[PDB]
């Protein structure tokens, strides 16, 4: 009777030692908007000592961070890059980000891509899916 559990086959551990350890996030799809997604999970990955470069080429700051029109702009090592695009636009950016040296590439939800999970694996990051970041580490930290 095996349970459900996430389909990246990660388990509580390997999350909790990602959210511990890889504190330098390109955060793609930022927004000013209070109201989406990406910004209230930037603001709780500020509040929790992350260090978030947005990424989104229509804007130039958000949350009071410089926001960057590439994860390859950003003057910094990144090791996560925490997704809030389409999953199309999303191949791109694990593009960049595997070109960048991230770590691990992190699909919120409603961003998976097959496609781009699959560049991911080959180029040897790990891939986090289906999950917030804001609520595992809630989850598992909080
Ligand atoms: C993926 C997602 C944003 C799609 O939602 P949507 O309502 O269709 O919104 P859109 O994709 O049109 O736009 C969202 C942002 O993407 C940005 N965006 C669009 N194209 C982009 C690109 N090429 N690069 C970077 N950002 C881009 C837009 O600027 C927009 O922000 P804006 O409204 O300030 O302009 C949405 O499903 C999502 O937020 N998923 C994550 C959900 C989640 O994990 N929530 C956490 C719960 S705890």
Redesign the pocket.
């Known amino acids: 009777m095996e349970e459900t559990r996430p389909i990246d086959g990660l388990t509580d551990e390997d999350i909790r030692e990602i959210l511990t350890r890889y504190k330098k996030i390109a955060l ?6 209070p109201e ?6 930037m603001k709780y990955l500020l509040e929790h000592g992350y260090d978030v470069y947005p ?5 130039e700051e958000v949350l009071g961070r410089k926001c960057y029109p590439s994860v390859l702009d950003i003057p910094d090592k990144i090791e996560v890059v925490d ?5 199309k ?1 999303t191949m ?2 694990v593009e960049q980000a595997i070109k960048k040296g991230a770590k691990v590439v992190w699909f ?4 998976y891509n097959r496609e781009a999970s699959k560049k991911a694996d080959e180029a040897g990051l790990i891939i986090v899916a289906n ?2 970041m ?2 595992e580490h809630e989850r598992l930290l909080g």
């Open positions: 793609v799809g930022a927004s000013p908007k989406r997604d990406a910004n209230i999970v990424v989104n080429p229509k804007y997704l809030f695009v389409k999953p636009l791109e950016y919120q939800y409603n961003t999950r917030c804001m609520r």
